[PDB]
Structures are given as structure tokens and as C-alpha cells.
Design a protein around this ligand. Structure first.
Ligand SMILES: O=c1[nH]c2cc(C(F)(F)F)c(N3CCOCC3)cc2n(CP(=O)(O)O)c1=O
Ligand SMILES: O=c1[nH]c2cc(C(F)(F)F)c(N3CCOCC3)cc2n(CP(=O)(O)O)c1=O
Lengths: 358, 81, 95, 49, 47
């Protein structure tokens, strides 16, 4: 049993012209064949009815989704992105994690190219503009000593005009020459430096970690209106995550979205004013999808992991468990992920930056 | 040990601790909280963009030096006269 | 001479044009620096190091089967790209 | 004792370190940064990470 | 004034210093452009 979730299990292009297991393709589809090869058994890929993962209705006390089909003998094994939770480990058996993950942050790709007159004060540092002005009057005063109270004012205004930039009194002569060589170097430095930003032009981003989302308010952020992601912050007693929840809990308008697609759309249409918190796995995949305008930032907020689920006290139990460990050590798991996330991806990150010009 | 009595209990215990965020808490306690370096990490929160004053400074000293040289050549001229 | 009024005008206007001509020079340099950065497709390794320029082989033949079976570093990556490149980078005939 | 984690000498085929003290009944449980490897999962039991 | 002799001297010397200051400016731009080119090891692929 498995769920339809990209890029783990998807319907092949010409699935209508195919049958059996050939109809499906994805990370878990390949992972199934690998597990079956090391455990030695034939299998039939089937999609769960209700299309859910594995929850437990409080009232009826009934399990649904894949976890359900396992407990009620509908399936023999579950190969999908099934989270290893305590509530499930009690009813079924989870093999060692075949993919560690967690909660990540998604923001809009920093294409920030605003006006801001502060891109002119950057090339030449504020400290440098100051000293060049101090030395400016520092020369107009030295020249002023070269040449009764008003006579000093008319001269100080003349040396200030000799300052406002453009006979053979050797003294003040070398002053004008050295000052010229001085300003020559500066204007050359300004020109050269200004050429740099407009040549390379690498983008920077504000938010680096989760603590950055709590320390600021300019950039709104939220999670899915329902799921372990939202329930995580609510129950989290950790310092940073606490404040985050407090904000999202009363943030207006609603920072929570209906579906994952809505969340991504909100990040792509807010010009970097809205961040979305979701599972790293799905996030990393989104980053490799057109128009390649989303990116994951910072490390995960918690440590989770998917695993192969097998009915409590099953024969495939131990075998599958070892199989997962064997696959990971052979780097086969990492290979599969690279195949469906980056290789099969549409957005070479270091390639999209190597193929973009201005 | 394979086929132990503590097997299942401990397994569930680990899952329970992680969900209660107790595991993450413990790590933070011994790695970052008990850590000696929140200073080099607070500065690694950000370094900024453009040019320095260092290089430009060297040209400032040669300027004042030229001004001083002139202030010296000036004095001597008035003396000879 | 030293007509302070129009004097600072000439100075400020000079500082104004100074910035502009400096901007023009700097900006003109980036367009020429990048113009050189664009390196012509010289070797096969150049096709793998970039993605802007797509590339492929014949859909059937020793040429295609070469990359598929090749265990060489460069040719490996090339095949990985062509194997999943969309749209199809492979053609029906040589024409 | 030996201050090792858990390896297996090819020749003597003997386990050492904590993993060893578990297989030979020296200890009841191992609480340490013990990596969950296939070679060990075969002789002992690993709880979730 | 127009002392042709020393006149072309001032002109050639001007053209000389023009090239040098242009070279200094251009080269200085390159030292900052390359200074940015040096990308810190962000990933393993960078090693
Ligand atoms: O076992 C579970 N595995 C899951 C695996 C994934 C995915 F990452 F897509 F593989 C997701 N998504 C993440 C992004 O939003 C769309 C679906 C949800 C999962 N849920 C539901 P939860 O209750 O919200 O955690 C589980 O229960
Ligand atoms: O089960 C194992 N757990 C281990 C845990 C750790 C640590 F991270 F310190 F907790 C380390 N170190 C990492 C840094 O170098 C000093 C010691 C080695 C471990 N090894 C040896 P491996 O064969 O090199 O992996 C194991 O076998």
C-alpha cells in the first residue's frame, strides 16, 4: 500500500496504456523494488482508498489510510512517506528511517533590486565620505594660511572655492598637487568599487534561521491550518518556537493556508513578505520546480523520519528493517533521492545562477 | 540485547521523549546552552557588503604629510624674505 | 572670480557630473566583463558545467549508447542530464 | 572496558566495546552515541534514532 | 603660451598619465570583482 504523493509515488505519463506496477513511478516506487529484491518477494503496488496516511478518529477509534489498511489486514506492507510516530508505533511496526527530515522554512527567491539611495552611500563608506570632507576643509584651511577680519572671510571663501574641486607658490603648490593625487585615488576607488556590485551582483537574504522569523515582524509567516506542522508549534515548549506560535495564533489576517499549494502561492505572490513553514522533503522538491522562485533556508526545526510500515508481528518485519539499513549504507537511498529531487528536477540551483545574466 | 525485555519499552520511550521535545531540549542544553560560544555566532548572524576604510586611509596620511611638508616650506619662505 | 554664489554651483555641478561619468564607466565595465565571461563551447566538459545551452544525441545509435554505458566522469553527468532532459534532447534523424 | 563502540574483528569474529558487552551478557542496555548500522542490527536491537 | 616644443611635451605627458590612471582604475575594479568571485565553501560540491 502507498499514497499518491510527488515525487514518491506518481502516475506515469502514459499510465493509461500501462498496467500493474508499471503504472506508477517515484522514490517509493523504486524503493519498493529494492526492498522486494533484498527480501525476495513479488508485490502489487496499490493506492490507499481514502488517500490518507495514518490517523485515529477519537470517537470511532478507527485507523484510516495506509496505517489502517495494515491493522485491518487489507495490505501486507506500507512503502510510502509514512512518518514514524509514537501513536503508530504502538499498533504497527516501523523499520529504521529511510529518510530523515523535519520542518523547514520557505521564502521567495531574493530578486531584490529596489532603488534605495543607500546603494550610493555603500560604495564609498560613510566613514570615508566623512574623512574626505574633513581633509577637504583640512586643505582649504592650510591654503587659507598661505595668503582684517573680513579679509579672512573673503579668503576663506576663496580657498573654499579652491576646495570645491576642479602662481608658483611652491608651498601651497604641492598642496594642490598632493590633494589632487588624493582625490584621484578616491574617485578611482569609487569607480572601481561601483563596477563590482554591478558585475557579480550576488543576492542576499534576511532570514537565515527560525530565530530570525521571531526577532522580526516585517515578514509574515505561517503554517498549514491543520497538520503535525501546526500542532508542533502549538505544543512546543521551546523558547523560539513558542514566540512564533504566539504570533501565528493571533496574526491577522490568517497566516495559515488551506493546502500546501496555497501556501507556496502565497510566498510567490507576496514579493518575499510571507514565509511558509512545511516539511523539508516537500520543500526541497518545490525548490526544484518552475519557475524556480522558492528556496529553503536554514536547517530543520526538528528531527523526524519516514519508514517502512509492517503489521505488528509480521514475517517481513526483520527482513525489511535490515533491507533499509543495507540500502542506506550502499548509498542507494541517497542515490534515489538525488534521482527524483535534483536529477529529475527542473531547477539546477547552481546552474540557474550560472545561466542568469543582467 | 536481541530478544530483551527492555526492547519494546525503551523503543517507545525514545519516541515519547522526541515528541515531547525532550530530546531536542537535552541537545540544546549540552550543545548551545552549556556552550561557550554564542558570541562568534551572534557575529556570524551577519557581516555586511561594501568597501573598507583601510586602503583609503593610507592615502589620507600621505595627504596630511603633504600638507605638513607645505606648511614647512611656507615657514621657511617667509623667513628668507 | 570668487563669486561664492555661482562658485558652489560650479563645484556641486562638477561633483554631480563626476558621479555620473564614474557610474557610466563602472556600468560599461560590467557589460564588458560579463561579455568576456561568456565562454564559447570549447570542450565536452563545458557542456556539463553549464545548462543554458541544451544538448543531445541521436535517439538510437552507438553515439547515444556510448554515454549510457560510459563510466567516465564528464560523460556520466552529460548522460544523466540528457536522460531526463525535457523536452526530448534526442532527435529522430541526423538531419 | 576497552572504551570502544562496537566493531567486529574479522579473524576472531569477536565483538568489542559496548555492542560486545551486550552480546556477551556484560550489560543489559547501551545508552550512548551508538551508530545504528546494519552489521550491528543483526546481533542486537536498536531503538528508533 | 604656444611654445610648440614644450607644448607637445605637456600633451604627451597628459596622454601618458591618462593611460596610467585608467589602468589603475580598471585594475582596481578587477581586484574587487575577483574578491567577490571567491565563493566560500557552502557545500561539499564546492570542495
Ligand atoms: O505520515 C505522514 N507523512 C507525510 C508526508 C508528507 C510529504 F512530505 F508530502 F511526503 C506530507 N505532506 C507535506 C507537505 O504537504 C503535503 C503533504 C504529509 C504527511 N503526513 C501528514 P501530517 O499529519 O501533516 O504530518 C503524515 O501523517
Ligand atoms: O557507533 C559509533 N559512534 C560514534 C560516535 C562519535 C561521536 F560523534 F563522538 F559521538 C564518534 N566520534 C566522532 C568524532 O571523532 C571522535 C569520535 C565516533 C563513533 N564511532 C566510530 P566510527 O567507526 O568512526 O563511526 C562509532 O562506531
Amino acid at each position: 500500500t502507498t499514497i499518491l504523493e510527488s515525487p514518491y509515488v506518481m502516475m506515469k505519463a502514459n499510465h493509461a496504456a500501462l498496467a500493474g506496477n508499471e503504472r506508477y513511478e517515484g522514490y517509493c516506487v523504486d524503493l519498493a523494488a529494492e526492498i522486494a529484491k533484498h527480501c525476495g518477494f513479488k508485490y502489487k503496488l496499490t493506492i490507499v482508498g481514502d488517500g490518507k496516511y495514518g490517523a485515529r478518529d477519537a470517537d470511532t477509534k478507527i485507523w484510516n489510510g495506509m496505517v489502517g489498511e495494515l491493522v485491518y489486514g487489507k495490505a501486507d506492507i506500507a512503502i510510502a512517506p509514512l512518518t514514524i510516530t509514537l501513536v503508530r508505533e504502538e499498533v504497527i511496526d516501523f523499520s529504521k528511517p529511510f529518510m530523515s527530515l523535519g520542518i523547514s522554512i520557505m521564502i521567495k527567491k531574493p530578486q531584490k533590486s529596489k532603488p534605495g539611495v543607500f546603494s550610493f552611500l555603500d560604495p564609498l563608506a560613510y566613514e570615508i565620505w566623512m574623512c574626505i570632507v574633513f581633509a577637504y576643509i583640512g586643505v582649504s584651511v592650510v591654503l587659507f594660511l598661505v595668503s582684517t577680519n573680513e579679509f579672512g572671510i573673503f579668503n576663506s571663501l576663496w580657498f573654499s572655492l579652491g576646495a570645491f574641486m576642479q602662481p608658483r607658490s611652491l608651498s601651497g603648490r604641492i598642496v594642490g598637487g598632493v590633494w589632487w593625487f588624493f582625490t584621484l585615488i578616491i574617485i578611482s576607488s569609487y569607480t572601481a568599487n561601483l563596477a563590482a556590485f554591478l558585475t557579480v551582483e550576488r543576492m542576499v537574504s534576511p532570514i537565515e534561521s527560525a530565530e530570525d522569523l521571531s526577532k522580526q515582524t516585517e515578514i509574515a509567516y505561517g503554517t498549514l491550518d491543520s497538520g503535525s506542522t501546526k500542532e508542533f508549534f502549538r505544543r512546543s515548549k521551546i523558547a523560539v518556537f513558542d514566540k512564533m506560535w504566539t504570533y501565528m495564533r493571533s496574526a491577522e489576517p490568517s497566516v495559515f493556508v488551506r493546502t500546501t499549494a496555497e501556501g507556496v502561492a502565497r510566498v510567490r505572490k507576496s514579493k518575499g513578505k510571507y514565509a511558509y513553514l512545511l516539511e523539508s522533503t516537500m520543500n526541497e522538491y518545490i525548490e526544484q520546480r518552475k519557475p524556480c522562485d522558492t528556496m529553503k533556508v536554514g536547517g530543520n526545526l526538528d528531527s523526524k523520519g519516514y519508514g517502512i510500515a509492517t503489521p505488528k508481528g509480521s514475517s517481513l518485519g526483520t527482513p525489511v528493517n535490515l533491507a533499509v539499513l543495507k540500502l542506506s549504507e550502499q548509498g542507494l537511498l541517497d542515490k534515489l533521492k538525488n534521482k527524483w529531487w535534483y536529477d529529475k528536477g527542473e531547477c539546477g540551483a547552481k546552474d540557474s545562477g550560472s545561466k542568469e545574466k543582467t | 540485547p536481541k530478544g530483551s525485555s527492555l526492547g519494546t519499552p525503551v523503543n517507545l520511550a525514545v519516541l515519547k521523549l522526541s515528541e515531547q521535545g525532550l530530546l531536542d531540549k537535552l541537545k540544546n542544553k549540552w550543545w548551545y546552552d552549556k556552550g561557550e560560544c554564542g558570541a562568534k555566532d551572534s557575529g556570524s548572524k551577519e557581516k555586511t557588503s561594501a568597501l573598507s576604510l583601510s586602503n583609503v586611509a593610507g592615502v589620507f596620511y600621505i595627504l596630511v604629510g603633504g600638507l605638513g611638508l607645505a606648511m614647512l616650506v611656507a615657514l621657511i619662505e617667509f623667513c628668507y624674505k
